[PDB]
């Protein structure tokens, strides 16, 4: 029994983030728990101030006509409890619920180890014999407690796109609302656990440029190659199959190469030493101890610029 | 209280995909969230335009008789909320729900690393004292937002098989409807994380064809053998027990062989060098450094053709 | 309000398997989704054909008295939706539901890698002021679509034990019904991923019978010992703590021995070579290169027979 | 509307275990599925045998006053379905439900690999304007099918503590009932997969007492040290953070020491051999090959006695 | 239909912890199961002692007006069952429920291996046409059975902040109540499984200061480096991405350095021995065997103080 209008009914929205958590980098989701603020003028609900009780009159969701406001990008339907309906005298209704859903918005792991993300929540509304348009009421969009957690990420800013996008689906237009949560991953921890450890094994590998023994050199360069796989796999895990290349997956793959030519070298600095040509052999090894480190640091300036610098 | 017909009642179907996700290669499933469009002529519901209110009259699911449309290949029953019922004057009903289920359709990992899949959804309907036939109304089968995600896969095309298959179960025929989702796995990421890394260790292994030391050679060929197991196991995991052979599991198994004959060789290039016959020994090793690489690349053209080329 | 009989009321059962999946070898369970067919004569429900409407009269589960048919070996209560109740004129009721539960039946990993299993579903019924006996109606026990999946297993045959077992519990007898699903694990994949890889490392280990160097021999025999642990652990995982010995766990444990005596030997073929007694030393090593391989293949014929052959 | 007594109302309890499973050593829980038998005399429910229908009169849980019997040590509320209420003529009520909950009782991993445990279920009841006391009726406490599974454990005996413990909580006493399930872990499988494999690597380590080469000795003693970590970690996992020391965690830690002094030795049997003092060096190594094995077996008799023997 | 006051209505709270468990260090949560004690004077509920039945009159939650007391920091809504409502004659209501939720409170892994935590539960209440203030009634806040488990932690003290914080949200103030659970992690188990094992490999690494062989030294220092990664990764896991540095992650990272300079040394103690300068070479190695151990123990006193001592 919708409210009989003369034109499009405006439903006024606002989400107050109470809780954030379980951002799943693997599954591209995240859990949230907030308020849902809704307000619309239903004239049938007007009620003569002085003639009746107080300022406002509260109802049970049953009696009043209430808009169906579905969330778009949610795995399931949001488990919500109704906090309060307060019908103004003029007919203005003040609906308020506290929902709890897991939303589904994509993530760009382009600069993975260090990256900012922007999460979305959508809110559509299907129209019937009348049209509905949703729209934000910033005084409730302020959605953010000063205790919003979401570990591993720095929460930048929760806001909403004031202009709804009014689609037109299966005959009957709908009104969508974009709510936005910006976040910057807290890297750091990635250094002492991935970056640094992963580099040290790379360096230790090429102390085989100051060694003349093939045995201790295969042991040296190969043992570390393994550890880099241990790291490659470790990272490879908490991270989805992007169709594109990831910054840290680039450097981590480039590192595979330095282990190969490293071997190529030691394997060659051998076919020369035993080829009674140690004149040339220890010339190559002499070069390596400068080439490798330079071309690496060099290549990272190139690579890092390639990603962030562009 | 079914609508009294004169023949088979046609229920008109249509699924509008709103959300896709959680394709579980392991468990052969996937999660979806869409619209369910249903339409049927119930003559008892006809209602004299001018004599009553407006064009259409909305009901609560309770009052009207509504067909039971079960999904066939679903783990459980689909959690659905009813968006709208709109009874036309002639009696045409316009049912619409937004469901959310995990479907269960098989996958062919025949060309695993690079493979296309076709997902299914079924929709049956059991008949009573009357017969029901389902059938598509393409204007609602268009089921696909321009935001359909499903990570790691490229979504080809959502469509439906217009002709239902009318079984006959436990006395009382049913009408099934095949809805189809085609997808092509986004490989790529498999190269810098599996393919390439896995090859490099294979090459490094057989730099032992340019080495004359049994120690650094066992170290060489064996250490890498291990890493290939590390890779074999890693892949082996996110992948079910197919009764058939998988493309990447073929090459990954074929690789086990090159590590064996590699050892065979170095183990033999030793029983000869110490058998004061280094004439023959370094003849074998000289061969290996060409045989191995050729017969490999060679065998892949064979194998790859065997899979995709046929 | 049970139907007043003159003797034991027969409830007629039948399960039509629609979906199978999630056989958890670890947890000894498995998920199923089927029809539940129930039929019983309630004479109070008889209804004069010509005097009233049609052949049969459908009810809502509420009105009619309906038997409580609990599943015995289920983790929880089965999530079921009622498809149809159709009361015959004589009083014969035709109940039909589509349930979805995870059943709990044991598994014998005696011949693990290659083994057949028989799954169970139970269906009891508690009696009140009257006795109930359940019993199969094969025309609904046919429970099996030609699309029954259950990956990794070959589904042999779904059937039911026609004779119920009528216990007697807490005063008030019950009627249990054994439904049976036979399955044969699809091994195969176990070869190129466990069996073969696991053997190759065993062979490579004992190329140390054609080597005279203690260093490359410890490297050889030990490195592979490790990989066999990597395999031992890998298998050890997707497999519960049986109180008995498993076929593949037997060979995989027996393999541990060949790595020990292998070491014993190389460790001994050393205390002799350095004991200026290389006459004896290379006599032992000469033996090993025949003993080991024979006694192994030999022991497997013994072991394999021990399991399957008996 | 409680039954008006003259003193404390006795509610008669009894749990018939139908299903056991999912004992989580990690989380100290376990899942069960049983009957709940309750019986109490409500005199208002008396009903003149001959004047009315039959022996007993069945009700829907709604009508009758029924005691709230909460389980104490349960994660959540137990999902129960009501099987039957049968009011005797005198007023004796016969309540019966089939519940399904996960209980939470502690475990003592003191003798971990081989240990017996005793599981608990509690059943309290809060009193109102009258007092309630619970108490067992052994004829229903017999709770145990001859098919009670619970894999990996041998089920000893299900019984109940007949005397309730009547606390006094937030003003209003309660009656608690201790039900007990004794179980003995099926070890065995721990031998061929942990114990034995873990020992073999320990032995192989100290074949370095019959070797004079520092290289093959570091390779020997170190490689195995690693595998023992592989085992240490493997075990360390399916096992909670006890504040006390676990039997197998003791021996597994003690093993770490034999790998250290082993290294100490080989590292010392080197600083002597190169110190032109091989007289002393191969005296130490000669000792080790007897000391180590003895002091180990010796220390286990000590340790094992320390745990089980005391 | 709220109770008509003359000022702010005081609702009296109290949580009696019955069960604790599933503290997820990863997800910063934990599960609890307790009583919820609520009491408020609703004068409309007053009921003339002698004129009617007994002391108190019990209701079903339906009839009475009852405050909505939401938990703040909970993933979802708390699954609660209502134990008893007991309306006093004056109008004092005695509400009591037994809820079961997972709460979400942060954790400081600053001194991780050894650390105390303080868990929170919040309880807000939204006001309508009247104001509500919550407040503790210590006689029910005593929330703690003498069987409160929560494995791996020592439970210090459950208490509540008597003064509520009265916010002001979306127009309509609310009353929040801070309940506090203090806990001290049971470390210990971290020694024989992480600390000690992790140290032993560090020591064994630098027995390469008493060795003159580059091969057995790379083998020595590198093999252990790996194991420390095995440990680094193992710990790295059951532990979230803190933006700060963790005590055990500090020492575990500092350990990476001692493995690098260790290599630096052995790699240098080689470029000197082969540079016909063994005078200097074995001077460096002589230093190391004292420098390393000192500077380590030294650095830990520094580091440990840095964390706990400050």
UniProtKB/Swiss-Prot annotation, chains A, B, C, D, E:
| SUPFAM superfamilies referenced in this protein's UniProt entry, alphabetically | Neurotransmitter-gated ion-channel transmembrane pore (SSF90112), Nicotinic receptor ligand binding domain-like (SSF63712)
User: What InterPro entries does this protein's entry cite?
Assistant: GABAA/Glycine_rcpt, Neur_chan_lig-bd, Neur_chan_lig-bd_sf, Neur_channel, Neuro-gated_channel_TM_sf, Neuro_actylchol_rec
Identify its membrane topology class: Multi-pass membrane protein
* CDD domains membership: LGIC_TM_bact
The portions of this protein that span the membrane are: 187-209, 213-237, 246-274, 278-310
Gene Ontology MF terms in the entry: extracellular ligand-gated monoatomic ion channel activity; identical protein binding; potassium channel activity; sodium channel activity; transmembrane signaling receptor activity
Places the protein is found: Cell inner membrane
Effect of substituting residue 223 to A: Increases the binding affinity of TBA
Q: For side Periplasmic, which residue ranges?
A: 1-186, 238-245
Identify the keywords attached in UniProt to this record, alphabetized: Cell inner membrane, Cell membrane, Ion channel, Ion transport, Ligand-gated ion channel, Membrane, Potassium, Potassium channel, Potassium transport, Receptor, Signal, Sodium, Sodium channel, Sodium transport, Transmembrane, Transmembrane helix, Transport
Q: Which residues lie on this side of the membrane: Cytoplasmic?
A: 210-212, 275-277
What Pfam families does UniProt report for this protein, alphabetically?
Answer: Neur_chan_LBD (PF02931)
Gene3D superfamilies from the UniProt entry: Neurotransmitter-gated ion-channel ligand-binding domain, Neurotransmitter-gated ion-channel transmembrane domain
Any single Gene Ontology cellular-component annotation: plasma membrane
Which residues, by range, are in coiled-coil regions? none
Note the effect listed for residue 195 to Y.
Answer: Marked gain of function, with a ten-fold shift of the proton dose-response curve towards lower concentrations
Activity regulation reads: Tetraethylammonium (TEA) and tetrabutylammonium (TBA) inhibit the proton-activated currents in a dose- and voltage-dependent manner in vitro, whereas the blocker of acid sensing ion channels, amiloride, has no effect. Channel current of GLIC can be inhibited by inhaled and intravenous general anesthetics at and below concentrations used clinically. Ion conduction is also inhibited by lidocaine and by divalent transition metal ions such as cadmium ions.
Oligomeric state and interaction partners are given as: Homopentamer.
Q: What is known of its domains?
A: Consists of an N-terminal ligand-binding domain that encloses a wide aqueous vestibule and a transmembrane domain that forms a narrow channel.
Extra facts:
The homologous nature of GLIC to eukaryotic nicotinic acetylcholine receptors and other eukaryotic pentameric ligand-gated ion channels, and its sensitivity to general anesthetics, define GLIC as a structural and functional model of signal transduction in the nervous system, also relevant for exploring the molecular basis of anesthetic action.
* Family per record: Belongs to the ligand-gated ion channel (TC 1.A.9) family.
What function does the entry list? Answer: Cationic channel with similar permeabilities for Na(+) and K(+), that is activated by an increase of the proton concentration on the extracellular side. Displays no permeability for chloride ions. Shows slow kinetics of activation, no desensitization and a single channel conductance of 8 pS. Might contribute to adaptation to external pH change.
Q: What name does UniProt use for this protein?
A: Proton-gated ion channel
């Amino acid at each position: 029994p919708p409210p009989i209008a003369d034109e499009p009914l405006t439903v006024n929205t606002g989400i107050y983030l109470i809780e954030c958590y379980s951002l799943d980098d693997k599954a591209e989701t995240f859990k949230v728990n907030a308020f849902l603020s809704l307000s619309w003028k239903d004239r049938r609900l007007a009620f003569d101030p002085v003639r009746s009780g107080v300022r406002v009159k509260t109802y049970e969701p049953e009696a009043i006509w209430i808009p169906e406001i579905r969330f778009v990008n949610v795995e399931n339907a949001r488990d919500a409890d109704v906090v309060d309906i307060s019908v103004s005298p003029d007919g203005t209704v003040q609906y308020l619920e506290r929902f709890s859903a897991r939303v589904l918005s994509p993530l760009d792991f382009r600069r993975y180890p260090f990256d900012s993300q922007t999460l979305h929540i959508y809110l559509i509304v299907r129209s019937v014999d009348t049209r509905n348009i949703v729209l934000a009421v910033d005084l409730e969009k302020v959605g953010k407690n000063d205790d919003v957690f979401l570990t591993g990420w720095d929460i930048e800013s929760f806001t909403a796109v004031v202009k709804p996008a009014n689609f037109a689906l299966e005959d009957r237009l709908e009104s969508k609302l974009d709510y936005q949560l910006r976040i910057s991953r807290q890297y750091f921890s990635y250094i002492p656990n991935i970056i640094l450890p992963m580099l040290f094994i790379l360096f230790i590998s090429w102390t085989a440029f100051w060694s003349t023994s093939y045995a201790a050199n295969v042991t040296l360069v190969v043992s570390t190659l393994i550890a880099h796989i241990a790291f490659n796999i470790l990272v490879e895990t908490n991270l989805p199959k992007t169709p594109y290349m990831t910054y840290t997956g680039a450097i981590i793959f480039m590192i595979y190469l330095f282990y190969f030519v490293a071997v190529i070298e030691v394997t060659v600095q051998h076919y020369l030493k035993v080829e009674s040509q140690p004149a040339r052999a220890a010339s190559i090894t002499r070069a390596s101890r400068i080439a490798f480190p330079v071309v690496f640091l060099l290549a990272n300036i190139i690579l890092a610029f390639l990603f962030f610098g562009f």
